[PDB]
UniProtKB/Swiss-Prot annotation:
Belongs to the pancreatic ribonuclease family. The gene is RNASE1. This is Ribonuclease pancreatic. Pancreas. The active site is at 12 (proton acceptor), 119 (proton donor). Disulfide bonds join 26-84, 40-95, 58-110, 65-72. Keywords: Disulfide bond, Endonuclease, Glycation, Glycoprotein, Hydrolase, Lyase, Nuclease, Secreted, Signal. The chain holds residues 27 to 150 of 150 of the full protein. Endonuclease that catalyzes the cleavage of RNA on the 3' side of pyrimidine nucleotides. Acts on single-stranded and double-stranded RNA. One of its GO terms (biological process) is defense response to Gram-positive bacterium. Its main location: secreted. Its EC number is 4.6.1.18.
Amino acid sequence: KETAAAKFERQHMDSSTSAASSSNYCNQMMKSRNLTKDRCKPVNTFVHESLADVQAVCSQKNVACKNGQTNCYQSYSTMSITDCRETGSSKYPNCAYKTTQANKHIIVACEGNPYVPVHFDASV
Ligand SMILES: [Cl-]
C-alpha cells in the first residue's frame, strides 16, 4: 500500500515545470501519475513548487479543513498551481481534462513524523 505522504506527492507535486505550458497538460499528467487507470479522477490539483516548499507549509498558518479537522495549513505565499478537472467530453477510458493555471495559496492537511502533507484541501 502506498503511504499517505507518497500518495500526496504522486497526486499533487509537479516541481519539474514552473507552470502548465499548454491546454494538454492535465491530460498528460493525469495519465502519467496513474490517476486514470481504472476510472477518471474527477478533480486534481498539481503544485509547481519544490517538494521542500510544499512540505514547509505544514509549519505555516494552521486553519480549519473543509471537513472540520484541525490539521490543515495555508501557505503564507501564493504558489504556481494547475487545476485539472474532467470536461463533458470525458468518458473512461478516454479521460479528458480542462487545465487551469493559477497562482494561489494552497491548503494542505498534515500528519505524521515527519509532519508532512497528506491531503490537498483547497487553493485560495
Ligand atoms: Cl485536488
